[PDB]
Amino acid sequence: ACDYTCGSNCYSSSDVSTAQAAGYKLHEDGETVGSNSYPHKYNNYQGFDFSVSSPYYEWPILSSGDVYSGGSPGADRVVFNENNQLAGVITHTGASGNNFVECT
Ligand SMILES: Nc1ncnc2c1ncn2[C@@H]1O[C@H](CO)[C@@H](O)[C@H]1OP(=O)(O)O
Ligand SMILES: [Ca+2]
């Protein structure tokens, strides 16, 4: 069973923890990877019910289980705040354009 389901992608809590740790470290270091510069600021204009405060940052989570290293970021993202608290797991899959929907 999946702790988070993004479109057809299945993620366990461990996958999420791993991705967040990686993205957070980059953030602390003032570093980014990829053409789209991850991690990058995330604005909650869709009003997702996040239980932690902003600012928020988005970092790609890969279906493969590997940590994002600068290539295709896919559609899924982990969202974390300035304090390294998990805000949520979202995806571009099933949303129009560059918008998002929450993973279930
Ligand atoms: N797989 C994908 N599906 C839809 N939009 C995507 C995407 N990968 C990147 N984007 C969006 O494309 C634009 C330029 O790359 C950004 O708005 C980026 O949003 P993101 O960084 O929030 O994922
Ligand atoms: Ca996995």
User: What determination technique applies here?
Assistant: X-ray
Instruction: Compute the distance between CA of residue 27 and CA of residue 32 in angstroms, rounded to an integer.
Output: 7
Confirm or reject: Cβ of 73 under 6 Å from ligand 1: yes
Of 16, 26, 2, the C-alpha closest to 79 is: 16
Could you tell me if residue 34 is left (phi over 0), alpha (psi between -120 and 50 degrees) or otherwise beta?
A: left
Instruction: Compute the distance between CA of residue 19 and CA of residue 14 in angstroms, rounded to an integer.
Output: 9
Pairing of strands 56-60, 76-81: antiparallel
| CATH code of residue 15 | 3.10.450.30
- Tally the domains of the chain: 1
Of 31, 84, 97, the C-alpha closest to 57 is: 84
Residues near 33 by beta carbon (within 8 Å), at least 6 away in sequence = 26, 68, 69, 70
Per annotation, catalytic residue among 28, 58, 82, 102: 58
- Report resolution in angstroms: 1.9
Q: Give distance in angstroms: CA of 102 to centre of ligand 2.
A: 18
Strand partners, 10: 5
Give residue 80's domain range.
1-104
Amino acid type, 98? N
Question: Are 42 and 58 a contacting pair, CB within 8 Å?
Answer: yes
Backbone angles phi, psi at 13, to 5 degrees: -55, -40
